Specification:
Entry title: solution NMR structure of reduced dsba from escherichia coli, minimized average structure
Order of helices and strands: EEHHEHHHHHEEH
Number of domains: 1
PDB class: oxidoreductase
CATH superfamily: Glutaredoxin
Name: dsba
Strand content: 5-15%
Keywords: thiol-disulfide oxidoreductase, introduction of disulfide bonds, protein folding, redox-active center, oxidoreductase
Structural class: alpha+beta
Number of helices: 8
Largest sheet: 5 strands, mixed
Assembly: monomeric
Number of strands: 5
């Protein structure tokens, strides 16, 4: 069996009309977070096999601390706004996985300002409409699907993949079976 409803992908009780063909949920606070966007390349590897029509969206979660985790979600919006993600992600990814000093919204600012995004430009971006539009759709993304386990993925807001328990001894089969679930999941309709 290769996907038997609940094995690799279970169905949601609340679908989201207009949802992205591949809603990706990940925070800068998980062990896979880094291994997903830095080593395994499972994020860049699936893009290689993403033909026009498969909307792969990557959103940030706000259920990983409550204090700065919520403002770190604002990080995904304030960064995607200035394209400073790649810049503040390195010091943010390494700051949450090899220090644990990233536990205050004020800390998220230290890394943001480290990329030259002074609180003046960062606050301006947030206060703007485009960054706010990504903040609204952000809190909505996790509020529409609800989100309940990082990393989490939702196809067209109707089928969620399930890394719920896959840490055996083959990152190979995971990257192949995973890329296969998204490849066919693009033909979900």
């Amino acid at each position: 069996a290769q996907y038997e409803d609940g094995k690799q992908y279970t169905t949601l009780e609340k679908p989201v009309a207009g949802a992205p063909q591949v809603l990706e949920f990940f925070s800068f606070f998980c062990p896979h977070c880094y291994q997903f966007e830095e080593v395994l390349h499972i994020s860049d590897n699936v893009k290689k096999k993403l033909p026009e029509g498969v909307k792969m969206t990557k959103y940030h979660v706000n259920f990983m601390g409550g204090d700065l985790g919520k403002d770190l979600t604002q990080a995904w919006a304030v960064a995607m706004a200035l394209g400073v993600e790649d810049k503040v992600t390195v010091p943010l990814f390494e700051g949450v996985q090899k220090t644990q000093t990233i536990r205050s919204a004020s800390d998220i600012r230290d890394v943001f300002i480290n990329a030259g995004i002074k609180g003046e430009e960062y606050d301006a971006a947030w206060n703007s409409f485009v960054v706010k539009s990504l903040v609204a759709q952000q809190e909505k993304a996790a509020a529409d699907v609800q989100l309940r386990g990082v990393p989490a993925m939702f196809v067209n807001g109707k089928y969620q993949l399930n890394p719920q328990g896959m840490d055996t001894s083959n990152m190979d089969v995971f990257v192949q079976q995973y890329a296969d679930t998204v490849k066919y999941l693009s033909e979900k309709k």
